Amino acid sequence: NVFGVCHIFASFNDTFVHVTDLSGKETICRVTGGMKVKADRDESSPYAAMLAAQDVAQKCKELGITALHIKLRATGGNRTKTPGPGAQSALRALARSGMKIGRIEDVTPIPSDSTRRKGGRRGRRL
Amino acid sequence: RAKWRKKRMRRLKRKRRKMRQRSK
Amino acid sequence: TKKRRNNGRAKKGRGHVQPIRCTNCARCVPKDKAIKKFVIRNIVEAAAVRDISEASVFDSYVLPKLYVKLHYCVSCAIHSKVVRNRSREARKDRTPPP
Amino acid sequence: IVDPFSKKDWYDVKAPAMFNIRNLGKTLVTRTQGTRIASDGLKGRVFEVSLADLQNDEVAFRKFKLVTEDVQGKNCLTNFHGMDLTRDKMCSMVKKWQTMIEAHVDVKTTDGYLLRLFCVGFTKKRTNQIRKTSYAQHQQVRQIRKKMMEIMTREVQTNDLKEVVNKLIPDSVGKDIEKACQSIYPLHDVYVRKVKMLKKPKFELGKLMELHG
Amino acid sequence: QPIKLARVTKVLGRTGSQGQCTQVRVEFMDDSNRSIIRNVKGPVREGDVLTLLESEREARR
RNA sequence: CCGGAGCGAAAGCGUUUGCCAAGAACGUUUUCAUUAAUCAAGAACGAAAGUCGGAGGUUCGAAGACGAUCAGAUACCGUCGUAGUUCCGACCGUAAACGAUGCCGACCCGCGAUCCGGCGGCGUUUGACCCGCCGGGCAGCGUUGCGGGAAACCACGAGUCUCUGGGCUCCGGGGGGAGUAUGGUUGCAAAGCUGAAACUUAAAGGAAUUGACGGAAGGGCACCACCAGGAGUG
RNA sequence: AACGAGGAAUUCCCAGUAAGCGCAGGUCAUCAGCUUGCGUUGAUUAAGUCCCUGCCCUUUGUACACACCGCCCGUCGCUAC
Ligand SMILES: [Zn+2]
């Protein structure tokens, strides 16, 4: 089995699935939900991430990638740490599309102590 | 908001000082 | 009138605590007044853990969990349904809900 | 126009022979086009692999970064670059109602390998303990951090990079600190969490073949 | 992949937004394995037979 | 990790290590021997913003531009960004600087925890944990239906108040006018401290209760709701 | 003549019920494309849910109490002190 590393930037307003080699140096294939939907409002929807990892499996099989290490990633830093809605739809679409998954681990950029986050002391009053 | 009654009062006192300063 | 004996925070014997930021609104909330919520959930959902299990190249691999420490302000901890408005006598129950 | 993957050839990444397996996977890079040789990119890559992918009967939360340093015959050779625990297992060891004493040293081995090893230990609640909180005093915190910084340097200074790696794959350093701190306050999860390599010495291929031999 | 058949063994309760789905656990008949639960739509009682096209997922709610 | 835990007169204070001189509590058959308590006048300190003079300006972000929404947004939302936010010195002395509760002292309930020190007791473990006790410290619960209060609530008393007197300082006298005017005074300025009157007004306000309401939460109900469809309207 | 099972939407109903069919009464000198009844033929689907839209109860908040069709703030404009 040709092991790989799959970087899933599961955040809000967009969902990224980035498949690279074992070192993460060369990008084998990467797509976004906006590449499959007409309106950018449906980017964070799990249906867009469902179509994203689907065609990725073909590009992984065409080049020879069979297994993919899951590297789940949220926005991190000052912003939220919980991954977006595409964290599970893209992960399930990867295994269901005839691939292999192994050694799942999430890498979210959590800071020891960040700077002042966007929005004042009163917070985003939406 | 009682704080803006204090904001407008400090703004009115500051204008009364400029009127009283030009009468020196 | 004073609604809570502790004024809605855990400041006893102190004059000022370090304010932290919320999660869903990014509001400066004191450390003792923050609505702590230690979320520990699996990386893969229970509805999709079986698809990842059969696709695992190993025999028995326990899926890790998402250990997230969330902070909520009073205005958001209620909108997000983390905490509710309890009765006058029910507010004194400091026991965590089961 | 043309698919860039047509000029990409696969290289089998390897590892030091002190582990249980050398085959770590496959990498990819474009072939030599002009002056830019394909070796100009496969000599600086880093592979972050876990211990269960390196060892056969060890834990899976200890990840090891292996930087590439030489390519010999369509295969890419690697060497130690840095250890780091998983994000999830690190957030699980930290618990409430107990003191957390961290420590970090930056000392080099017998060779010019400057290593920065990070160790983290937590105190342990006694079995017959009725008190909820197990809090050691501030001076009791210092004594625990003293032994944590002293053993990280002593065990890494009397050996070269090859031997300390074999002492790094298990928790050999973490188990002795808990026994040392027990004389003052019992600890629970004494663990070396991260190893950072800041500066790299003038590498000799003679010592590389001695490890991989 | 070969098709597998199963008999309804127990009804759990109504699921779905409108309550049209009925969570019902099934059990294979030919080979005694994978006594997994499935989601059924319509009137379901004890003793029915569901021709499961797959045997991989639970699909709770 | 970090807690209704500690420390400090407060504001305030949590990465490592080092340096520097303080502090409570406890220990004491040490020492001094009433040297006190509270304190007009006077002074140190005092979050943040602001101000003057340098460095640095990541992020955030007054102002400001622009993007959206609306009948209209000079806002919330979004991009960007000055001052500012960061550090250095001199100012400013203002906060819901709140425990909205001065300091000292006596007396006046109980229990379980917690913090530091001391004391004596089966044990476990090479101080840790266990059972207590004495002294202060942050607090909590229970009873306040041994009291107090308009009540909410109060043993960090808000108890020992017509059965009124332990000591002392500050301060309030219906709501507005108004922390305004004026004078003095401080300040680079913004402003700080001190502080009126004319005039106007029969209420303002506190606590609690029942209704109503919420764009609050929870639960429940009906083919004038939907699901599943079936008729027909448009 | 338009109307080829009919736009976005929308009404009704789960048993002799919906619907189809026709009758009779009320209105009425003359009249039923209406309505109140009546019998006739006779199903589809469902023996459910807060999903949606309407609804009461409890908790909670209030400066509301001829009660959210509530109350109330400032600028501007008029007059008087
Ligand atoms: Zn907040």
mmCIF file of C-alpha atoms in Angstrom, chain C:
data_model
loop_
_atom_site.group_PDB
_atom_site.id
_atom_site.type_symbol
_atom_site.label_atom_id
_atom_site.label_comp_id
_atom_site.label_asym_id
_atom_site.label_seq_id
_atom_site.Cartn_x
_atom_site.Cartn_y
_atom_site.Cartn_z
ATOM 1 C CA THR C 1 -31.258 43.834 43.297
ATOM 2 C CA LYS C 2 -28.358 41.422 43.728
ATOM 3 C CA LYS C 3 -29.286 38.395 41.631
ATOM 4 C CA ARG C 4 -26.385 36.137 42.669
ATOM 5 C CA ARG C 5 -24.308 36.025 45.840
ATOM 6 C CA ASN C 6 -21.141 35.459 43.789
ATOM 7 C CA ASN C 7 -22.230 38.065 41.186
ATOM 8 C CA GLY C 8 -22.037 35.403 38.475
ATOM 9 C CA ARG C 9 -18.294 34.816 38.831
ATOM 10 C CA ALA C 10 -15.774 32.994 41.020
ATOM 11 C CA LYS C 11 -13.892 36.056 42.322
ATOM 12 C CA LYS C 12 -13.489 35.603 46.088
ATOM 13 C CA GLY C 13 -10.595 37.346 47.807
ATOM 14 C CA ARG C 14 -9.375 38.988 44.590
ATOM 15 C CA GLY C 15 -9.820 42.339 42.901
ATOM 16 C CA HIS C 16 -9.141 41.505 39.264
ATOM 17 C CA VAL C 17 -8.598 38.359 37.199
ATOM 18 C CA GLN C 18 -7.176 37.833 33.730
ATOM 19 C CA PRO C 19 -9.830 38.295 31.006
ATOM 20 C CA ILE C 20 -9.942 35.645 28.284
ATOM 21 C CA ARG C 21 -11.657 35.566 24.893
ATOM 22 C CA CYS C 22 -14.850 33.739 23.968
ATOM 23 C CA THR C 23 -15.162 31.220 21.131
ATOM 24 C CA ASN C 24 -18.235 31.973 19.001
ATOM 25 C CA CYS C 25 -18.102 35.757 19.530
ATOM 26 C CA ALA C 26 -14.534 36.540 20.730
ATOM 27 C CA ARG C 27 -15.586 38.641 23.727
ATOM 28 C CA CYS C 28 -13.261 39.532 26.599
ATOM 29 C CA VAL C 29 -14.632 37.440 29.475
ATOM 30 C CA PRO C 30 -12.938 37.110 32.892
ATOM 31 C CA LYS C 31 -11.278 33.782 33.620
ATOM 32 C CA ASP C 32 -13.525 33.083 36.616
ATOM 33 C CA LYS C 33 -16.660 34.265 34.781
ATOM 34 C CA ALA C 34 -16.038 32.181 31.647
ATOM 35 C CA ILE C 35 -18.391 29.298 30.845
ATOM 36 C CA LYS C 36 -15.910 26.429 30.721
ATOM 37 C CA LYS C 37 -16.764 23.527 28.413
ATOM 38 C CA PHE C 38 -14.191 20.769 27.835
ATOM 39 C CA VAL C 39 -15.381 19.133 24.607
ATOM 40 C CA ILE C 40 -13.897 15.667 24.009
ATOM 41 C CA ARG C 41 -15.307 14.072 20.849
ATOM 42 C CA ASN C 42 -13.966 11.508 18.403
ATOM 43 C CA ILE C 43 -12.223 12.673 15.241
ATOM 44 C CA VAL C 44 -14.587 10.521 13.148
ATOM 45 C CA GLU C 45 -18.333 10.377 13.747
ATOM 46 C CA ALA C 46 -19.994 7.233 15.064
ATOM 47 C CA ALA C 47 -21.968 7.067 11.806
ATOM 48 C CA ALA C 48 -18.721 7.080 9.793
ATOM 49 C CA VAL C 49 -16.358 5.268 12.182
ATOM 50 C CA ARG C 50 -17.219 1.931 10.556
ATOM 51 C CA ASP C 51 -16.174 3.091 7.083
ATOM 52 C CA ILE C 52 -12.835 4.272 8.485
ATOM 53 C CA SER C 53 -12.455 1.066 10.514
ATOM 54 C CA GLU C 54 -12.722 -1.243 7.499
ATOM 55 C CA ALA C 55 -10.438 1.091 5.519
ATOM 56 C CA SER C 56 -7.787 1.000 8.257
ATOM 57 C CA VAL C 57 -4.674 -0.859 7.094
ATOM 58 C CA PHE C 58 -4.140 -2.194 10.639
ATOM 59 C CA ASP C 59 -5.946 -4.703 12.848
ATOM 60 C CA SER C 60 -6.984 -2.629 15.890
ATOM 61 C CA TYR C 61 -6.389 1.136 15.913
ATOM 62 C CA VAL C 62 -8.262 3.316 18.403
ATOM 63 C CA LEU C 63 -9.348 6.567 16.782
ATOM 64 C CA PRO C 64 -8.129 9.585 18.804
ATOM 65 C CA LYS C 65 -10.434 12.303 20.141
ATOM 66 C CA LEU C 66 -10.758 16.073 19.724
ATOM 67 C CA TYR C 67 -9.874 17.652 23.080
ATOM 68 C CA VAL C 68 -11.192 21.214 22.745
ATOM 69 C CA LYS C 69 -11.377 23.725 25.609
ATOM 70 C CA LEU C 70 -14.199 26.163 24.842
ATOM 71 C CA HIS C 71 -14.988 29.478 26.532
ATOM 72 C CA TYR C 72 -18.433 31.080 26.315
ATOM 73 C CA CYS C 73 -19.721 34.472 27.370
ATOM 74 C CA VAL C 74 -23.033 34.775 29.199
ATOM 75 C CA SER C 75 -24.806 36.157 26.127
ATOM 76 C CA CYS C 76 -23.541 33.300 23.929
ATOM 77 C CA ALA C 77 -23.577 30.389 26.393
ATOM 78 C CA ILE C 78 -27.359 30.856 26.523
ATOM 79 C CA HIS C 79 -27.880 31.396 22.790
ATOM 80 C CA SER C 80 -25.778 28.302 22.052
ATOM 81 C CA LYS C 81 -27.932 26.428 24.618
ATOM 82 C CA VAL C 82 -24.886 25.592 26.739
ATOM 83 C CA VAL C 83 -26.514 27.030 29.876
ATOM 84 C CA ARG C 84 -30.149 27.865 30.586
ATOM 85 C CA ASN C 85 -32.041 30.319 32.779
ATOM 86 C CA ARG C 86 -32.984 28.347 35.888
ATOM 87 C CA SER C 87 -35.569 29.088 38.561
ATOM 88 C CA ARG C 88 -34.835 31.334 41.533
ATOM 89 C CA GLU C 89 -34.169 28.333 43.786
ATOM 90 C CA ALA C 90 -32.620 26.204 41.018
ATOM 91 C CA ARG C 91 -29.763 28.657 40.381
ATOM 92 C CA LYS C 92 -28.165 27.652 43.693
ATOM 93 C CA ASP C 93 -27.533 24.119 42.358
ATOM 94 C CA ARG C 94 -23.822 24.163 41.515
ATOM 95 C CA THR C 95 -23.899 20.474 40.549
ATOM 96 C CA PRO C 96 -23.059 19.807 36.876
ATOM 97 C CA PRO C 97 -25.972 18.402 34.858
ATOM 98 C CA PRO C 98 -25.771 14.607 34.332
#
